[PDB]
Amino acid sequence: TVAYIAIGSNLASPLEQVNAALKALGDIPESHILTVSSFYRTPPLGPQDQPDYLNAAVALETSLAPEELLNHTQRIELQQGRVRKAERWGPRTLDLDIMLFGNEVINTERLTVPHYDMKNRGFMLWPLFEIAPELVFPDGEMLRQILHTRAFDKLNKW
Ligand SMILES: Nc1nc2ncc(CNCCN3CCC(SC[C@H]4O[C@@H](n5cnc6c(N)ncnc65)[C@H](O)[C@@H]4O)CC3)nc2c(=O)[nH]1
């Protein structure tokens, strides 16, 4: 099954956090990374005094069930998501979202797939379009069409 995963980090210098999360993703059992989008720098949703986000998409081949993949992504956020802030551990700055899991539709307490808000987020849709331009959602909407219809601005690379 091909799962598409969104990575975001809003650390001032997020490259090494993002690199560590990609390494950890590739170490998930019965799984392996097929492709990684470029890294994009996007303004934060809301207050603009806040730090920019680094966003990327990852294609991961996996034979895990969806909630097992989620357990791994949540473990990775716990282990890698916090950077040492001199005298103490900083806030969580890394997000890992499951955007798609094969052609599955999932609505449980833990998991909504396709991701509940990705259709509104250029910073999710554009990196996904880089690695999967012909992508079709389970309901038959085409990724290309959603971008064409909403005309989100293209993103700057980090
Ligand atoms: N420029 C830019 N601005 C941004 N502004 C705001 C944000 C906000 N963080 C996105 C991650 N936010 C918040 C934390 C919750 S975390 C709660 C819960 O979400 C549940 N969940 C349900 N479906 C899920 C799924 N498909 N993938 C993963 N978790 C799933 C899960 O059980 C968890 O307990 C997951 C969704 N990001 C960006 C960004 O990047 N870029």
mmCIF file of C-alpha atoms and ligand atoms in Angstrom:
data_model
loop_
_atom_site.group_PDB
_atom_site.id
_atom_site.type_symbol
_atom_site.label_atom_id
_atom_site.label_comp_id
_atom_site.label_asym_id
_atom_site.label_seq_id
_atom_site.Cartn_x
_atom_site.Cartn_y
_atom_site.Cartn_z
ATOM 1 C CA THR A 1 0.000 0.000 0.000
ATOM 2 C CA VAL A 2 1.232 3.498 -0.738
ATOM 3 C CA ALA A 3 0.713 5.928 2.106
ATOM 4 C CA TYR A 4 1.349 9.655 1.579
ATOM 5 C CA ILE A 5 2.620 11.483 4.682
ATOM 6 C CA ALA A 6 2.848 15.215 5.235
ATOM 7 C CA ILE A 7 5.825 16.536 7.242
ATOM 8 C CA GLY A 8 5.812 19.958 8.871
ATOM 9 C CA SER A 9 8.212 21.664 11.296
ATOM 10 C CA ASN A 10 8.085 25.258 12.454
ATOM 11 C CA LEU A 11 11.462 25.359 14.141
ATOM 12 C CA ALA A 12 13.603 28.371 13.251
ATOM 13 C CA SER A 13 16.110 25.891 11.745
ATOM 14 C CA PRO A 14 14.102 22.845 10.926
ATOM 15 C CA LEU A 15 16.291 20.982 8.476
ATOM 16 C CA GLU A 16 17.951 18.658 10.962
ATOM 17 C CA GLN A 17 14.602 17.902 12.667
ATOM 18 C CA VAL A 18 13.043 17.110 9.294
ATOM 19 C CA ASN A 19 16.063 14.954 8.313
ATOM 20 C CA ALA A 20 15.730 12.991 11.561
ATOM 21 C CA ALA A 21 12.023 12.395 10.974
ATOM 22 C CA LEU A 22 12.712 11.162 7.412
ATOM 23 C CA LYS A 23 15.376 8.800 8.719
ATOM 24 C CA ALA A 24 12.911 7.538 11.374
ATOM 25 C CA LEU A 25 10.145 7.079 8.768
ATOM 26 C CA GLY A 26 12.458 4.938 6.638
ATOM 27 C CA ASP A 27 13.121 2.752 9.682
ATOM 28 C CA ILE A 28 9.446 1.867 10.236
ATOM 29 C CA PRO A 29 8.974 -1.946 9.993
ATOM 30 C CA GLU A 30 7.674 -3.540 6.781
ATOM 31 C CA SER A 31 7.843 -0.096 5.146
ATOM 32 C CA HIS A 32 10.119 1.987 2.969
ATOM 33 C CA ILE A 33 10.264 5.435 1.467
ATOM 34 C CA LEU A 34 9.588 5.611 -2.255
ATOM 35 C CA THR A 35 9.887 9.372 -2.845
ATOM 36 C CA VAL A 36 10.286 12.637 -0.944
ATOM 37 C CA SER A 37 9.050 15.982 -2.310
ATOM 38 C CA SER A 38 11.255 19.069 -2.219
ATOM 39 C CA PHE A 39 11.227 21.079 1.009
ATOM 40 C CA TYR A 40 9.057 24.132 0.974
ATOM 41 C CA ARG A 41 8.965 27.205 3.110
ATOM 42 C CA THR A 42 5.439 28.393 3.912
ATOM 43 C CA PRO A 43 4.082 31.230 6.090
ATOM 44 C CA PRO A 44 2.220 30.028 9.179
ATOM 45 C CA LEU A 45 -1.604 29.884 9.185
ATOM 46 C CA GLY A 46 -2.689 32.893 11.256
ATOM 47 C CA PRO A 47 -0.370 35.140 13.346
ATOM 48 C CA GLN A 48 2.428 36.213 11.051
ATOM 49 C CA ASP A 49 4.868 36.991 13.842
ATOM 50 C CA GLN A 50 5.217 33.158 14.044
ATOM 51 C CA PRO A 51 8.038 31.168 12.406
ATOM 52 C CA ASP A 52 7.737 29.787 8.881
ATOM 53 C CA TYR A 53 7.030 26.130 8.368
ATOM 54 C CA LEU A 54 9.076 23.649 6.445
ATOM 55 C CA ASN A 55 6.624 21.380 4.584
ATOM 56 C CA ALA A 56 7.171 18.224 2.546
ATOM 57 C CA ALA A 57 5.386 15.113 1.352
ATOM 58 C CA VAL A 58 6.634 11.554 1.523
ATOM 59 C CA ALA A 59 5.475 8.505 -0.335
ATOM 60 C CA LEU A 60 5.857 5.372 1.872
ATOM 61 C CA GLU A 61 5.242 1.812 0.668
ATOM 62 C CA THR A 62 3.952 -0.208 3.640
ATOM 63 C CA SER A 63 2.282 -3.470 4.488
ATOM 64 C CA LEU A 64 1.240 -2.135 7.921
ATOM 65 C CA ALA A 65 -2.428 -1.534 8.786
ATOM 66 C CA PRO A 66 -3.311 2.189 8.966
ATOM 67 C CA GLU A 67 -3.557 2.495 12.755
ATOM 68 C CA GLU A 68 -0.162 0.676 13.067
ATOM 69 C CA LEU A 69 1.366 3.281 10.745
ATOM 70 C CA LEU A 70 -0.246 5.958 12.902
ATOM 71 C CA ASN A 71 1.269 4.454 16.044
ATOM 72 C CA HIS A 72 4.696 4.764 14.394
ATOM 73 C CA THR A 73 4.138 8.319 13.222
ATOM 74 C CA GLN A 74 2.989 9.242 16.736
ATOM 75 C CA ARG A 75 6.017 7.543 18.302
ATOM 76 C CA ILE A 76 8.278 9.497 15.903
ATOM 77 C CA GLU A 77 6.635 12.812 16.976
ATOM 78 C CA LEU A 78 7.224 11.917 20.652
ATOM 79 C CA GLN A 79 10.846 10.872 20.155
ATOM 80 C CA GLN A 80 11.925 13.461 17.538
ATOM 81 C CA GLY A 81 9.339 16.200 17.802
ATOM 82 C CA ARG A 82 10.959 18.149 20.609
ATOM 83 C CA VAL A 83 14.297 19.950 20.385
ATOM 84 C CA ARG A 84 16.481 20.798 23.419
ATOM 85 C CA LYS A 85 16.092 24.482 24.311
ATOM 86 C CA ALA A 86 19.301 24.960 26.343
ATOM 87 C CA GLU A 87 17.961 24.569 29.857
ATOM 88 C CA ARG A 88 14.921 22.448 28.950
ATOM 89 C CA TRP A 89 12.976 20.708 26.184
ATOM 90 C CA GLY A 90 11.173 23.031 23.782
ATOM 91 C CA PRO A 91 7.590 22.660 22.514
ATOM 92 C CA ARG A 92 6.607 20.086 19.924
ATOM 93 C CA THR A 93 7.565 21.519 16.510
ATOM 94 C CA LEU A 94 7.183 18.475 14.248
ATOM 95 C CA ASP A 95 3.936 17.219 12.697
ATOM 96 C CA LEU A 96 3.443 14.044 10.745
ATOM 97 C CA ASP A 97 0.008 13.698 9.094
ATOM 98 C CA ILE A 98 -1.252 10.733 7.122
ATOM 99 C CA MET A 99 -2.713 12.333 4.024
ATOM 100 C CA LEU A 100 -3.685 9.191 2.143
ATOM 101 C CA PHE A 101 -3.467 5.480 2.771
ATOM 102 C CA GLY A 102 -3.846 3.646 -0.518
ATOM 103 C CA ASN A 103 -7.374 4.136 -1.823
ATOM 104 C CA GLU A 104 -8.835 3.782 1.693
ATOM 105 C CA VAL A 105 -11.428 5.981 3.368
ATOM 106 C CA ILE A 106 -11.062 5.867 7.151
ATOM 107 C CA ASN A 107 -13.216 7.564 9.738
ATOM 108 C CA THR A 108 -12.470 6.427 13.258
ATOM 109 C CA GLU A 109 -11.803 8.154 16.528
ATOM 110 C CA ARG A 110 -8.076 8.164 15.774
ATOM 111 C CA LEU A 111 -7.928 8.523 12.030
ATOM 112 C CA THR A 112 -9.607 10.505 9.256
ATOM 113 C CA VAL A 113 -8.229 9.616 5.848
ATOM 114 C CA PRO A 114 -8.007 11.436 3.463
ATOM 115 C CA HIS A 115 -6.767 14.063 5.832
ATOM 116 C CA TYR A 116 -9.685 16.176 7.018
ATOM 117 C CA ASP A 117 -8.408 19.545 5.716
ATOM 118 C CA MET A 118 -5.812 18.889 3.045
ATOM 119 C CA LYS A 119 -8.155 20.253 0.286
ATOM 120 C CA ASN A 120 -7.778 23.706 1.821
ATOM 121 C CA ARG A 121 -3.997 23.647 2.287
ATOM 122 C CA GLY A 122 -1.688 24.616 -0.548
ATOM 123 C CA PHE A 123 1.248 23.625 1.685
ATOM 124 C CA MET A 124 -0.077 20.071 1.662
ATOM 125 C CA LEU A 125 -1.395 19.839 -1.888
ATOM 126 C CA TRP A 126 1.567 21.309 -3.797
ATOM 127 C CA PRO A 127 4.319 19.022 -2.406
ATOM 128 C CA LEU A 128 1.988 16.064 -2.942
ATOM 129 C CA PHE A 129 1.455 17.194 -6.556
ATOM 130 C CA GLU A 130 5.264 17.248 -7.096
ATOM 131 C CA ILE A 131 5.575 13.552 -6.287
ATOM 132 C CA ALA A 132 2.145 12.303 -7.442
ATOM 133 C CA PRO A 133 0.780 14.643 -10.169
ATOM 134 C CA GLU A 134 -1.708 12.016 -11.447
ATOM 135 C CA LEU A 135 -3.150 11.292 -7.983
ATOM 136 C CA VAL A 136 -6.884 10.457 -7.701
ATOM 137 C CA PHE A 137 -8.686 10.514 -4.366
ATOM 138 C CA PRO A 138 -10.978 7.681 -3.230
ATOM 139 C CA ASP A 139 -14.084 9.767 -4.189
ATOM 140 C CA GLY A 140 -12.710 10.377 -7.693
ATOM 141 C CA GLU A 141 -11.565 13.977 -7.324
ATOM 142 C CA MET A 142 -8.192 14.471 -9.021
ATOM 143 C CA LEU A 143 -5.398 16.313 -7.159
ATOM 144 C CA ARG A 144 -4.663 18.279 -10.331
ATOM 145 C CA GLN A 145 -8.331 19.434 -10.424
ATOM 146 C CA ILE A 146 -8.389 20.640 -6.826
ATOM 147 C CA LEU A 147 -5.288 22.781 -7.512
ATOM 148 C CA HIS A 148 -6.702 24.002 -10.819
ATOM 149 C CA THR A 149 -10.080 24.913 -9.225
ATOM 150 C CA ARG A 150 -8.694 26.758 -6.152
ATOM 151 C CA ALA A 151 -5.606 28.182 -7.846
ATOM 152 C CA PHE A 152 -3.460 28.107 -4.683
ATOM 153 C CA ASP A 153 -0.125 29.959 -5.124
ATOM 154 C CA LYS A 154 2.909 27.792 -5.831
ATOM 155 C CA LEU A 155 5.299 27.477 -2.844
ATOM 156 C CA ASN A 156 8.855 28.654 -2.394
ATOM 157 C CA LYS A 157 11.501 26.039 -1.776
ATOM 158 C CA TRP A 158 13.253 26.166 1.596
HETATM 159 N N1 LIG B 1 2.410 26.836 6.668
HETATM 160 C C1 LIG B 1 1.906 25.903 7.550
HETATM 161 N N2 LIG B 1 1.028 26.369 8.494
HETATM 162 C C2 LIG B 1 0.532 25.417 9.380
HETATM 163 N N3 LIG B 1 -0.362 25.912 10.341
HETATM 164 C C3 LIG B 1 -0.839 25.015 11.194
HETATM 165 C C4 LIG B 1 -0.493 23.637 11.152
HETATM 166 C C5 LIG B 1 -1.173 22.804 12.222
HETATM 167 N N4 LIG B 1 -0.580 21.500 12.453
HETATM 168 C C6 LIG B 1 -1.045 20.500 11.455
HETATM 169 C C7 LIG B 1 -1.124 19.166 12.223
HETATM 170 N N5 LIG B 1 -2.428 19.179 12.933
HETATM 171 C C8 LIG B 1 -2.344 19.544 14.384
HETATM 172 C C9 LIG B 1 -2.122 18.375 15.366
HETATM 173 C C10 LIG B 1 -3.109 17.248 15.041
HETATM 174 S S1 LIG B 1 -2.786 15.802 16.142
HETATM 175 C C11 LIG B 1 -4.396 15.277 16.780
HETATM 176 C C12 LIG B 1 -4.967 13.892 16.415
HETATM 177 O O1 LIG B 1 -5.234 13.773 15.032
HETATM 178 C C13 LIG B 1 -5.661 12.434 14.877
HETATM 179 N N6 LIG B 1 -5.667 12.194 13.478
HETATM 180 C C14 LIG B 1 -6.816 12.003 12.734
HETATM 181 N N7 LIG B 1 -6.561 11.829 11.453
HETATM 182 C C15 LIG B 1 -5.206 11.926 11.340
HETATM 183 C C16 LIG B 1 -4.387 11.830 10.217
HETATM 184 N N8 LIG B 1 -4.977 11.587 9.025
HETATM 185 N N9 LIG B 1 -3.012 11.954 10.379
HETATM 186 C C17 LIG B 1 -2.555 12.180 11.651
HETATM 187 N N10 LIG B 1 -3.254 12.292 12.806
HETATM 188 C C18 LIG B 1 -4.588 12.154 12.596
HETATM 189 C C19 LIG B 1 -4.687 11.555 15.729
HETATM 190 O O2 LIG B 1 -5.313 10.448 16.280
HETATM 191 C C20 LIG B 1 -4.172 12.606 16.774
HETATM 192 O O3 LIG B 1 -4.455 12.118 18.035
HETATM 193 C C21 LIG B 1 -2.948 16.794 13.580
HETATM 194 C C22 LIG B 1 -3.248 17.964 12.653
HETATM 195 N N11 LIG B 1 0.389 23.115 10.239
HETATM 196 C C23 LIG B 1 0.894 24.037 9.343
HETATM 197 C C24 LIG B 1 1.832 23.559 8.319
HETATM 198 O O4 LIG B 1 2.232 22.426 8.162
HETATM 199 N N12 LIG B 1 2.317 24.568 7.425
#
